[PDB]
Write a protein that binds this ligand. Sequence first.
Ligand SMILES: COc1cc2ncnc(Nc3cc(NC(=O)c4ccnc(N5CCOCC5)c4)ccc3C)c2cc1OCCN1CCCC1
Length: 334
Amino acid sequence: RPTFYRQELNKTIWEVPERYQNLSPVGSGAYGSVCAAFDTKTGLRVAVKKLSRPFQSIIHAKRTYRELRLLKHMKHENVIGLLDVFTPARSLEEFNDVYLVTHLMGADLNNIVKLTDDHVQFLIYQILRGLKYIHSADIIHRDLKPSNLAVNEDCELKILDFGVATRWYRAPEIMLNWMHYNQTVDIWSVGCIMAELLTGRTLFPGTDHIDQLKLILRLVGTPGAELLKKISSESARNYIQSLTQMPKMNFANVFIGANPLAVDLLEKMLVLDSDKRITAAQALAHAYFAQYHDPDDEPVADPYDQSFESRDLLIDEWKSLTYDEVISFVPPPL
Ligand SMILES: COc1cc2ncnc(Nc3cc(NC(=O)c4ccnc(N5CCOCC5)c4)ccc3C)c2cc1OCCN1CCCC1
């Protein structure tokens, strides 16, 4: 039970172990505030997030428990991982604040831009490697986009969720609930990201859900008979057939002058039918990534138990489950 010190910044009490020194605000919003800090135990530079009113409602409490469970399980080089979690509460009774600690990321993908073909290969490779890992434990990101990707000076990437319109990167089946989905909603997003790096521009910059679909269908074409057969909703089916029939464009006439193996991968990623879309694992083995792919260093995750998600609990039960998870936390080795 280490020594805590208090201090105020951004109009909020921070109460942290002495281990963590020199705190400096880096951004706050509805969900939590974040500080950079020096970690006197590893000489490393870290980021500390104070959750905003984590047990105010049933939604907040369950969400707080979800983030903590998730970060405790993720142990992979291309995925954010949990260095430490603490509370200044001595007991469950007085337990009201949660703090999460991770490696301090510098600049996101949004900030670091066009760019070389070798750079795109390496950046997209690392995202897929990280996606193979989380998808293997049935975890879906759902909000993959450049501002959720951290990239340091070595060009090393990590997937995270700081919590660019999201809709610009969203799979059309999730955006509209028009057809069932799987893990490959995130594969759609990656294709939108890769295109952007290849050409310097947002691929599909829609101004609402309808305009977004319009732009997308302009590129991939209206759904064929095969895909139209699996659209569950009657409304959605009508809309689509009531549109004016757009053809599939030739991707080489769109990504003009780009590396042909990347044009090919883009075509396997940006397919409308989600039964046909390439997975993370299959995509690691494509010829675009020949210089990086090693099937013996692209690991999968331990089984992840997410049954809690179907439960309807009271606030005090989620709060108590969170506290347990704080107490059983064992740090990762140096
Ligand atoms: C310099 O600005 C920084 C740096 C940071 N470094 C490290 N961590 C953080 N933020 C952070 C995030 C989290 N949680 C998650 O990342 C999270 C939650 C849920 N799910 C995931 N997954 C889903 C599947 O894939 C794995 C990821 C991740 C926990 C603790 C911390 C500390 C930051 C934050 C940061 O700045 C934030 C504000 N800033 C203002 C300028 C732009 C953004």
